[PDB]
RNA sequence: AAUG
RNA sequence: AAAUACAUAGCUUAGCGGCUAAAGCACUGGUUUCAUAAGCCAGCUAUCAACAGUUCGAGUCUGUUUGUAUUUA
RNA sequence: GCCUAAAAUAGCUUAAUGCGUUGGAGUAAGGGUUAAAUCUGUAAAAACCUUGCAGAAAGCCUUAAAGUAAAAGCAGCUAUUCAUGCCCAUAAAAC
RNA sequence: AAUCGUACCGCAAACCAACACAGGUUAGUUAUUGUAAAGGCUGUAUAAAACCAGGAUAAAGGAACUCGGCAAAAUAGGUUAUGUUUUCGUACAAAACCACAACAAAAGUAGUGACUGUUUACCAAAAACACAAGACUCUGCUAACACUUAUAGUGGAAGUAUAGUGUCUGAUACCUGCCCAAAGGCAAAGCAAACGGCAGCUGUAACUCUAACGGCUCUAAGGUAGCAAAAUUCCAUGGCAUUUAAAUGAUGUCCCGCAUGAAUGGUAUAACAACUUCUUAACUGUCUCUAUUCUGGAUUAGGCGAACUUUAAAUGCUUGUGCAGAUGCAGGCUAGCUAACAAGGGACGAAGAGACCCUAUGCAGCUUUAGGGCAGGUUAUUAUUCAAUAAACUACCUUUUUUCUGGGACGGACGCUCUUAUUAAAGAAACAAGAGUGAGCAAUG
RNA sequence: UUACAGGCAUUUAAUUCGAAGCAUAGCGAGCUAACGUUUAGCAGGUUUGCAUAAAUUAAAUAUAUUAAAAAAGCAAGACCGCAAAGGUUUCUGUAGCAAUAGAA
């Protein structure tokens, strides 16, 4: 078997992952929504209570 | 057995096995499309609706 | 071979003799893998995958190796046949466990480098390594059974097993259970290896081998009661030549065997060599097994042809 | 150098 | 019933156109031995299924009448 | 304290022999019998000098066994475990 | 907080089967001691034929039925002292004893496979296949091998000779003999648990018989043990014993056995079997031999409304005749008319351009030491830093495999001369008959 | 000799209809065969080989121990059997309810 992914490849990969960040407004609430640089869906993320930005959290 | 039964509706298998997208995902389906065409059926794929 | 009298007897430890209350555990020996303190259990989470099984299919969805599929589900473990990496460090052992996809045991070891948190890694349990036991590896090691050390600083008569053919790639040549490889002599830059087959070898110095032997001793005294024993592993049944059709086989016919014994595409296998004449590696080999020198098989058309 |  | 082979001293076994004959056992006589066997020496069987042909000349080549196998119905 | 052809356990030594063994040199036989032959070789054997690999057995000491190991049995070297045997010095009021 | 589904059918007259088709169709829930809450559904008009189907009862006998206990019936269940066989776990026999209403169905003998399993959808479920297990051979890791145009890539396997590929035997117990000559294949000049083979004649022991024992020929070797009237035997229903009143049957035994035989395994074997064979107990409408009866159809009435088939018809018997078995032709006979219910002799009755056999400008698949080729792999030789050529082995491609004939096959025959019968001109056939020949001569011109 | 009408012949789908088949390219695994991932199902009973606990419960109470279904478990290609999956024998049916069904 030549293709084999083992759990430390898997977390090599999930380390090195990009994404790019947009603030939204939802009901006078804020929100940060990301997508993987390798796809095409923007999904909603975290609130700025959770968050701080600026940072790389 | 009783035979005649060979039909088992699906309506996944259906789009999937004869849809547009798969007639078009290959050379030899677009050429099939281009024979409905010249032949003038009014309705190319089982997948079509308006 | 197995005898009905040894199932009766009972004698030989670790096993399980199953009492033939059914036909089908008659003649059913198995491993008592409690009363020698093996593990059984789930895989280090991270050193296992789970896995899809491929049932002897390739690439091209056509099947390639015959009589494979319909087993129980696949997980594989990550095995270091190279201890390089932690080559200072010294391990301890904390299981000796049970792998399905191998005939051998594996041994959970943790490493504690200084300044780093523990490193768990998965081995090839020698003969005689038990829970608690440290390993070592790397210049300066004791020659002691799990120990791995190059071929440069290991006696010629003491019994190596997982050796490597290249200097750092890993281990390949020993890995079945109970079995082991001896070296001897030792030349300028290589060393002169028996295998187990066998075989007598050129191996360079520099690789590294580990001392002792493989750890599963009770491999040929096991019997499988039921043919669906062997379907629960992966295996499928397979049907013989002479049964077949002739559009099937070469013996298809309805007499038996017309024709000498040979594979479903026409070959001769009741003694036709198959390896490469002029392989490049016959320069490493010095006698083939059952005692016939290299030159021998290398040049045996050419005369007769001559 | 078997036999009586 | 057709088809392929074979009938050779007392018994196995050479021979298949120049004469109608080879070898081994058996049989007979002698020698050795207190005597019988083994061993040695010398002899003997007109030596060629039956009939009709071919040929200067046929156990030998061609047909028929008998006997024996082998395959087929 | 010493000894042991006693038992169990584990390491070590090689005279000779065998070969689908290495290199050198050399050329018709080698082997065997009452007498022969099968067999092995001349396509390079046996014999001679060297190389590699392997199993079994223990020359002289060595003699009974005189140890008697309970009988069956027991001697290549070294060590461990254990049981005897020798010297020197002790021990038991009831077994 | 947007977007899509929400009706109706869904064990069915709405989905898959051309149909309102006795067929097929997933999951989740509910009442009920001997019963059963909720909910759901509903059939033209009659009856005192034959006959057919599915049930019930039956005197006396109890397999006498039949290829065969087919079908039907049957105290069917539980606990046992004792005995037998075992692979020691099992399995079987058993006087007797114990049962509220429901549910109910044997043992032994032989043959073959160990066992549970799998298979020809639509005539074969088996002794066939698989199976755990035994053996042989190949493979040193970029393993052998398979897929692929392969220079890729992938399976083997992320496994490493206690492993993987191929082949034949097929649990287990006791066993498993000889041959590598010729023609091939493979290999290290050897290989049989690779593909295969494993004789004949003749003389001899008190009377007889037989041959313990001799002689000869040939071969690579000449079939050893075991078993044996077989799932194998032409004579054949072999001889003897048991079984029955009666035995082409079954079991036991005798045995060079047309043509048994040791891993294409030999001989046994507890358990297991909708497998084949024989027997015992019981039971019975299987039978002597049938009778009565219930339900549904047929049959009678109203309504609705098919199909096979049809050259034309006003369509008797009998013997003769004839393309050789006549409703229709010739002789001898036959005289109220049309249907209903019932049976099935004939119309060489209906359905499907006979499958058997032979004949083709035949077709297809399979096999091989029938002919030719090289276009994959292996192997051999040569050359450049994944190549070229091929009388080899494997795979693949393509082509050939007469006619005559008292049907075809088997056998025999096919050119050219002489002679016999079909009279005395010539000619004249049959797988009719009787004989020659495919040369010789330098002189035999 | 040239042209025209006719009969016959040669070549080109050449009097009409009819094979089993051969070659090239595409469409099919919603039936069926094997396999992959995910999911679900199998009443009620019977026989047998094993398994003991954060400290099982009592008595002995040291010593020596003893009794108890004191176990919310594993194993069986195990047995009688409702569903379910099959298709052993019989009868019915045979353009049939059905181009393979019904009852036992
Ligand atoms: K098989
Ligand atoms: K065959
Ligand atoms: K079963
Ligand atoms: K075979
Ligand atoms: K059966
Ligand atoms: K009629
Ligand atoms: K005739
Ligand atoms: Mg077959
Ligand atoms: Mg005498
Ligand atoms: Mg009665
Ligand atoms: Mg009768
Ligand atoms: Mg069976
Ligand atoms: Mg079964
Ligand atoms: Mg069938
Ligand atoms: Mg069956
Ligand atoms: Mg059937
Ligand atoms: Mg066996
Ligand atoms: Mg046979
Ligand atoms: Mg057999
Ligand atoms: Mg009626
Ligand atoms: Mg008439
Ligand atoms: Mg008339
Ligand atoms: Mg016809
Ligand atoms: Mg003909
Ligand atoms: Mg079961
Ligand atoms: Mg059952
Ligand atoms: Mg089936």
Same mark, same amino acid.
Request: proline share 6%; with cysteine; net charge positive.
């Given at each position: ?14 380390? =090195? ?9 939802? +009901? ?30 | 057995?009783?035979? &005649? ?7 996944? %298998? ?14 030899? &389906? ?21 | ?57 390739? =690439? ?24 390089? #990496? ?7 052992? @904390?299981?000796?466990? %049970?792998?399905?996809?191998?005939? !051998? ?13 523990? $490193? ?7 003969? @005689?390594?038990? *829970? ?5 590896? !790397?210049? !300066?090691?004791?020659?002691? *059974? ?36 001896? $070296?001897?002599? #030792? ?11 066998? @075989?007598?070898?050129? $191996? =360079? ?17 096991? +019997? ?27 013996? !298809?016919?309805?007499? =038996? ?27 490493? $080999?010095?006698?083939?097994? &059952? ?16």
């Amino acid at each position: 078997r030549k293709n084999i992914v083992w759990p430390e490849q898997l977390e090599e990969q999930k380390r =090195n992952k990009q994404y790019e960040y947009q603030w939204v407004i939802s +009901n006078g609430k804020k929100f940060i929504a990301r997508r993987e640089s390798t796809s095409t869906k923007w999904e909603i993320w975290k609130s700025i209570e959770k968050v701080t930005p600026g940072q790389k959290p | 057995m009783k035979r &005649g039964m060979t039909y088992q509706p699906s309506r996944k %298998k259906r789009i999937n096995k004869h849809g547009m997208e798969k007639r078009l995902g290959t050379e030899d &389906g677009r050429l099939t499309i281009l024979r409905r065409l010249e032949k003038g059926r009014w309705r190319l794929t089982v997948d079509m609706f308006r | 071979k197995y005898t009905y009298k040894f199932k009766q007897a009972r004698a030989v430890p670790g096993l399980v003799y199953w009492k033939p209350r059914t036909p089908g555990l008659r003649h059913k020996i198995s491993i008592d893998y409690d009363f020698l303190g093996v593990y059984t259990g789930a895989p280090h989470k991270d050193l296992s995958a789970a896995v899809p099984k491929l049932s002897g299919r390739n =690439n091209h969805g056509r099947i390639t190796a015959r009589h494979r599929g319909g087993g129980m589900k696949k997980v594989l473990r990550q095995v270091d046949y190279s201890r390089e #990496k932690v080559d200072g460090i010294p391990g301890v052992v @904390e299981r000796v466990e %049970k792998d399905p996809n191998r005939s !051998g045991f594996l041994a959970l070891v943790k490493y504690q480098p200084e300044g780093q948190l523990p $490193i768990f890694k998965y081995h090839l349990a020698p003969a @005689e390594i038990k *829970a608690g036991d440290v390993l070592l590896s !790397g210049d !300066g090691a004791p020659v002691q *059974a799990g120990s791995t050390l190059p071929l440069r600083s290991i006696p010629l008569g003491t019994p190596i097993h997982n050796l490597e053919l290249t200097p750092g790639k890993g281990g390949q040549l020993a890995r079945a259970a109970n079995v082991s490889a001896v $070296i001897q002599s #030792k030349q300028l830059e290589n060393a002169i290896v028996k295998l187990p087959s066998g @075989e007598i070898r050129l $191996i =360079n110095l520099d690789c590294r081998a580990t001392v002792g032997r493989v750890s599963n001793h009770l491999q040929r005294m096991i +019997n499988y009661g039921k043919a669906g024993e062997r379907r629960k592993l992966g295996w499928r049944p397979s049907v013989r030549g002479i049964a077949k059709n002739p559009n099937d086989h070469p013996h !298809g016919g309805r007499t =038996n065997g017309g024709r000498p014994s040979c594979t479903p595409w026409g070959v001769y296998c009741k003694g036709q060599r198959t390896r490469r004449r002029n392989n490049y590696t016959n320069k490493f $080999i010095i006698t083939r097994k &059952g005692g016939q020198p290299i030159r021998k098989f290398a040049e045996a058309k050419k005369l007769k042809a001559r």
